[PDB]
């Protein structure tokens, strides 16, 4: 039922992974992958405002660092 | 505070003074967000005051810094 | 620039063109803010041009790259 920020962040991440898991072959398609990533960021900020925490905030930024390490860090910058 | 670099140091020290006594709580994400927001507000207030963009490379180094010393070892 | 990825290379190449002649000043924070602000504005402009979110993963990889090659080892205050 989502009643604090930590569990909100889990909610956002879970929705994000549901998008990212089955499209591994396109993680470095920068234009395409910008959509689910936007939905992650925006979810993170939406729930930051809902719980009156600022944005960015440390948990949100750990989450953004985590996707960069697991999805994007070893992508080529030109396809 | 004669310039941006010394304003950034001023911001950074008001932040640490808030953070050092509450090491136990550095991974209480809700709580810790407050002093962190003050640091960002400070970094941005002084950026505009010295007519520099935000984010900017020095402000970003301060953000990496606090992630490295306060939040890196935290369970998510 | 036929797409976002090539837009991001134009931004990045223009940035390096301004940075390379001022290597002795990469740690002059107030000074080096100008070319960096232009880089961010360039990344955001083309982002909005191609109706992608900003920030986005590719743009963030460029940010990380300048932090790694330009600013990682600078003193936080000049002598
Ligand atoms: Ca805009
Ligand atoms: Ca779009």
From Swiss-Prot, chain B:
Distribution of this protein across tissues and organs: Strongly expressed in lung, breast, immune system and fetal tissues.
Locations listed in the record: Cell membrane
Disulfide partners: 11-42, 27-74
This protein's GO CC annotations: adrenomedullin receptor complex; cell surface; clathrin-coated pit; cytoplasm; lysosome; plasma membrane; receptor complex
Listed GO MF terms: adrenomedullin binding; adrenomedullin receptor activity; coreceptor activity
Keywords, in A-Z order: Cell membrane, Disulfide bond, Glycoprotein, Membrane, Receptor, Signal, Transmembrane, Transmembrane helix, Transport
Lineage: superkingdom: Eukaryota
GO biological process: adenylate cyclase-activating G protein-coupled receptor signaling pathway; adherens junction assembly; adrenomedullin receptor signaling pathway; amylin receptor 2 signaling pathway; angiogenesis; basement membrane assembly; bicellular tight junction assembly; calcium ion transport
Extracellular topology ranges: 1-76
Annotated glycan sites: 73
Annotated family: Belongs to the RAMP family.
Subunit structure: Heterodimer of CALCRL and RAMP2; the interaction forms the receptor complex for adrenomedullin/ADM. Heterodimer of CALCR and RAMP2; interaction forms the AMYR2 receptor complex for calcitonin/CALC and amylin/IAPP.
Free-text function comment from the UniProt entry: Accessory protein that interacts with and modulates the function of G-protein coupled receptors including calcitonin gene-related peptide type 1 receptor (CALCRL) and calcitonin receptor (CALCR). Required for the transport of CALCRL to the plasma membrane. Together with CALCRL, form a receptor complex for adrenomedullin/ADM. Together with CALCR, act as a receptor complex for calcitonin/CT/CALC. Together with CALCR, also act as a receptor complex for amylin/IAPP.
Name this protein carries in UniProt: Receptor activity-modifying protein 2
Species this protein is from: Homo sapiens
Gene (name only): RAMP2
Segment of the intact protein contained: 58 to 133 of 175
């Amino acid at each position: 039922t989502v009643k604090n920020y930590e569990t909100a962040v889990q909610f956002c991440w879970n929705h994000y992974k549901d998008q990212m898991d089955p499209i591994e072959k396109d993680w470095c398609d920068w234009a395409m992958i910008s959509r689910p990533y936007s939905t992650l960021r925006d979810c993170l900020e939406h729930f930051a405002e809902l719980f009156d925490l600022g944005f960015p905030n440390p948990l949100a930024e750990r989450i953004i660092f985590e996707t960069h390490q697991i999805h994007f860090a070893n992508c080529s910058l030109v396809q």
